[PDB]
Design an enzyme around this catalytic site. Structure first.
Site, PDB file in Angstrom:
ATOM      1  N   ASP A  92      -0.356   7.393 -29.187  1.00 62.19           N
ATOM      2  CA  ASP A  92      -0.311   8.651 -28.879  1.00 62.19           C
ATOM      3  C   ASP A  92      -0.722   9.552 -30.008  1.00 62.19           C
ATOM      4  OD1 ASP A  92       0.894   7.921 -26.422  1.00 62.19           O
ATOM      5  OD2 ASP A  92       3.063   8.379 -26.662  1.00 62.19           O
ATOM      6  N   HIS A 237       1.812   5.154 -33.005  1.00 64.71           N
ATOM      7  CA  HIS A 237       1.158   6.721 -33.305  1.00 64.71           C
ATOM      8  C   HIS A 237      -0.053   6.495 -34.550  1.00 64.71           C
ATOM      9  CE1 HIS A 237       4.873   7.159 -31.338  1.00 64.71           C
ATOM     10  NE2 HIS A 237       4.478   8.525 -30.814  1.00 64.71           N
TER      11      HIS A 237
END
Length: 272
Positions: A92, A237
């Site tokens: 993400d 991430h």
């Protein structure tokens, strides 16, 4: 019995029935998975020279299931098929540009793809980094425009978040957006249904690295290996923890017998 008969006698032992897509009561929408049957000609040709049956030299024809992921009603996807020995990597991406080049190098080193779920405002403000991801042949998905809590958003705001982000991604990358993921995992049925109106599946996950808490890399790695399973979707991430752990993580996943790839590859019905 000659070699050809030996292969015939072993055919049923290695046959696998196709598995249909379904919505699991707990894990929700799950893809189907091809079955297989022994390919007599290819298997014989592989064992001809040594004149001995060896199951490691079997080759197979695949058999498709009858119910497919796209047949299901709109519903989130948490996992690939639980019999498919493959793991999906997802990142993400709304910050952390300083780790993006190194993460892309690590993926190139292992010849693996990941799905990058991009925030629309991040793409608008970082077009050259969005292009860097797709020029590395990685796939991109929709992570909303401003990272709101989409469960509490109005239908109008959900639609606007998704549409603005697709317009931004498609202009920066020239790729079709297949997959959407709700920020922080927060959603309701209306979110999934609107994403479906934009021809997007909704992708959750089964293994969370919790890398945003800056864990020690070996702690992140041990968390993943403890929780991983066939069909797992891993959430990361662009962080120092992920960047320091990703190389060994992929090596250890492959050593465990897993194929490693992106969401499109993970959910494919083709056998590993």
């Amino acid at each position: 019995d000659n070699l050809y008969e030996e292969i015939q006698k072993h055919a049923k032992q290695y046959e696998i029935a196709p598995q249909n897509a379904m919505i699991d009561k707990i894990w929700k929408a799950t893809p189907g998975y091809n079955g297989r049957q022994v390919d007599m000609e290819a298997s014989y040709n592989n064992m001809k020279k040594l004149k001995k049956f060896d199951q490691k030299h079997l080759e197979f024809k695949e058999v498709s299931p009858s119910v497919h992921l796209e047949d299901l009603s709109p519903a989130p996807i948490y996992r690939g098929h639980p019999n498919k020995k493959m793991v999906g990597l997802t990142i993400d991406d709304a910050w952390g540009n300083e780790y993006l080049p190194r993460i892309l190098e690590i993926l190139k080193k292992h010849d693996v793809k990941a799905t990058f779920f991009l925030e629309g405002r991040w793409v608008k403000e970082n077009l050259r980094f969005a292009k860097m991801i797709v020029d590395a042949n990685q796939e991109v998905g929709n992570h909303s425009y401003t990272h709101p809590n989409m469960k509490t958003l109005s239908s109008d705001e959900i639609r606007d978040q998704l549409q603005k982000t697709n317009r931004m991604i498609e202009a920066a990358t020239n790729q079709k957006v297949r997959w959407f993921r709700p920020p922080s995992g927060s959603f309701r049925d209306e979110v999934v249904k609107i994403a479906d109106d934009f021809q997007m599946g909704t992708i959750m996950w089964t293994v969370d690295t919790i890398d945003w808490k800056r864990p020690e890399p070996d702690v992140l790695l041990q968390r993943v290996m403890r929780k991983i399973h066939p069909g797992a979707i891993v959430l990361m991430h662009p962080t120092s923890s992920t960047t320091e752990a990703l190389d060994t993580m992929i090596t250890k996943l492959k050593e465990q017998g897993y194929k490693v790839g992106n969401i499109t590859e993970l959910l494919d019905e083709k056998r590993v």
